[PDB]
Scaffold this active site. Structure first.
Site, PDB file in Angstrom:
ATOM      1  N   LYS A 103      36.553  33.464  44.255  1.00 42.65           N
ATOM      2  CA  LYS A 103      36.572  34.862  43.757  1.00 42.65           C
ATOM      3  C   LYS A 103      35.521  35.036  42.656  1.00 42.65           C
ATOM      4  CG  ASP A 163      35.820  41.611  45.137  1.00 45.93           C
ATOM      5  OD1 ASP A 163      36.340  41.769  46.261  1.00 45.93           O
ATOM      6  OD2 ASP A 163      36.442  41.139  44.167  1.00 45.93           O
ATOM      7  N   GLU A 223      49.661  39.816  36.353  1.00 47.97           N
ATOM      8  CA  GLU A 223      50.066  39.807  37.756  1.00 47.97           C
ATOM      9  C   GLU A 223      51.196  38.813  37.967  1.00 47.97           C
ATOM     10  CG  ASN A 269      41.891  42.608  46.947  1.00 53.99           C
ATOM     11  OD1 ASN A 269      42.374  43.562  46.325  1.00 53.99           O
ATOM     12  ND2 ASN A 269      42.514  41.447  47.064  1.00 53.99           N
ATOM     13  CG  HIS A 314      39.942  33.053  38.871  1.00 54.03           C
ATOM     14  ND1 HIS A 314      40.663  34.203  39.105  1.00 54.03           N
ATOM     15  CD2 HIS A 314      39.287  33.251  37.706  1.00 54.03           C
ATOM     16  CE1 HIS A 314      40.449  35.061  38.124  1.00 54.03           C
ATOM     17  NE2 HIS A 314      39.614  34.508  37.264  1.00 54.03           N
ATOM     18  NE  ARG A 315      39.862  33.795  34.210  1.00 55.97           N
ATOM     19  CZ  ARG A 315      38.557  33.796  33.990  1.00 55.97           C
ATOM     20  NH1 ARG A 315      37.861  32.666  33.950  1.00 55.97           N
ATOM     21  NH2 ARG A 315      37.930  34.956  33.834  1.00 55.97           N
ATOM     22  CG  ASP A 361      41.065  36.353  30.922  1.00 59.47           C
ATOM     23  OD1 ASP A 361      42.295  36.447  31.093  1.00 59.47           O
ATOM     24  OD2 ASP A 361      40.256  37.219  31.305  1.00 59.47           O
TER      25      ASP A 361
END
Length: 426
Positions: free
Chosen positions: A410, A48, A340, A93, A384-385, A312
């Site tokens: 990521k 990214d 999401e 993305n 990824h969390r 998070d």
């Protein structure tokens, strides 16, 4: 393609966080707009961030990267980015690139299309497009309103605009970064409540680091004087993502040793630094350093706490509770359902597999650890969390297999190798 984590006797050491993707793209953009040469240290090398660099280079912005791509010196345009040819920029993305560039390229008189992968063309951006068109930007949604691809022919004036802050804060962030270079003062009214206010704090602080003040009125009206130009601070250190430190601070709390994380500090405006206070309440020792935070092991006790404020790193508390005495309850985390993917369901499902007794309330999770952890293949949900949260399960006599481990690449590809470097395997 999984990664099996072998049981870890004990962890102790130092972990340097790579740059936040958020901070990295914001800082690259502000250095690209700024008067002077900005040196960015601790820049994230992710694809990214690569798309952000490739876009800026296509815009004529000159910079030099280090061999490892984590150091970047930018010769700032000292104004809005200019392109004499029409452009079409593929942002892969990278929404944290799409949004800031969408706003900033409404400055000037260019003709540039922004596009990316189908996943991003599915990420809504209409709340930003509306506000930009309201201040005069000419924006054409080439397939459908509310989503890329976007044709950007500039024309952003400033003036009285509104943005919806109820879904994402990143729309407001893009607007704020663009507004100072508008010819007019910009008055940005927030429609409803403002979600994710600490990322707003982050953006405002970066902007002030670049010499631009903003009048923030109760996160409900933002006044930006026009006609300004950003001024390079010279050096700028990209601060690591605060959530990523949670896993290593928890690692120290659980099975240290002492784990020190750099790239973040006691005086960070990122919300998730408050994660550390939770570990201190569970019995761990927290040392609050200037450009680091450390956690030393103390006997871990369970806690019952509103986790509304740290969505998070609260997930990290959910896995660290496997090691605390008592039943932990993480309250007012309905945020996890509206994501999401529903993190509350997902975390409950994957906690039960390692032996835990899990209650899945409407907006809370209650975790009773097993007397003995179980080996399990943890599904990570493209998150990824999840991978980083359940990596702590090996901080015991029990292995754990993480599925889709590259989901961490990521934000933290070196996560497990750094985890490994501080580990002593049983």
């Amino acid at each position: 393609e999984s990664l099996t984590l072998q049981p870890i006797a004990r962890v102790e050491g130092t972990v340097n966080l790579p740059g936040s993707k958020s901070v990295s793209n914001r800082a690259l953009l502000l250095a690209a707009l700024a008067r002077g040469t900005t040196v960015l240290t601790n820049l994230l090398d992710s694809d990214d961030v690569r798309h952000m660099l490739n876009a800026l280079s296509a815009l004529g912005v000159q910079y030099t990267l280090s061999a490892d791509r984590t150091r970047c010196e930018v010769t700032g345009n000292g104004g809005p980015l200019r392109s004499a040819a029409a452009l079409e920029l593929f942002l892969g993305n990278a929404g944290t690139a799409m949004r800031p560039l969408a706003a900033a390229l409404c400055l000037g008189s260019n003709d540039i299309v922004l596009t990316g992968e189908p996943r991003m063309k599915e990420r809504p951006i209409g709340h930003l497009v509306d506000a930009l068109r309201q201040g005069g930007a000419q924006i054409d949604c080439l397939e459908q309103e509310n989503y890329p691809p976007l044709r950007l022919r500039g024309g952003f004036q400033g003036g009285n605009v509104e943005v919806d802050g109820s879904v994402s804060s990143q729309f407001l962030t893009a607007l704020l970064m663009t507004a100072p270079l508008a010819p007019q003062d910009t008055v940005i009214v927030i429609k409803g409540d403002l979600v994710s206010k600490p990322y707003i704090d982050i953006t405002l602080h970066l902007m002030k680091t670049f010499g631009v003040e903003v009048d923030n009125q109760s996160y409900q009206r933002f006044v930006v004087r026009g006609k300004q130009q950003y001024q390079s601070p010279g050096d700028y250190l990209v601060e690591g993502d605060a959530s990523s430190a949670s896993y290593f601070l928890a690692a120290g709390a659980i099975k240290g040793g002492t784990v020190k994380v750099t790239g973040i500090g006691r005086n960070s405006v990122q919300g998730d630094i408050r994660f550390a206070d939770v570990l201190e309440k569970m019995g761990a020792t927290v040392t609050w350093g200037d450009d680091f935070i450390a956690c030393t092991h103390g006997e871990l006790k369970a806690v019952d706490m509103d986790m509304n404020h740290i969505p998070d790193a609260a997930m990290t508390i959910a896995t660290a509770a496997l090691f605390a005495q008592g039943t932990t309850t993480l309250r007012n985390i309905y945020n996890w359902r509206v994501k999401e993917t529903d993190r509350l369901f997902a975390m409950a499902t994957e906690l039960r597999k390692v032996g835990a007794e899990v209650e899945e309330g409407e907006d809370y999770i209650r975790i009773t650890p097993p007397a003995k952890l179980k080996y399990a293949e943890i599904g990570t949900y493209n998150d990824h969390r999840m991978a980083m949260c359940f990596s702590l399960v090996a901080l015991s006599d029990t292995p754990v297999t993480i599925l889709d481990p590259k989901c961490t690449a990521k934000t933290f590809p070196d996560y497990f190798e750094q985890l490994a470097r501080i580990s002593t395997l049983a």
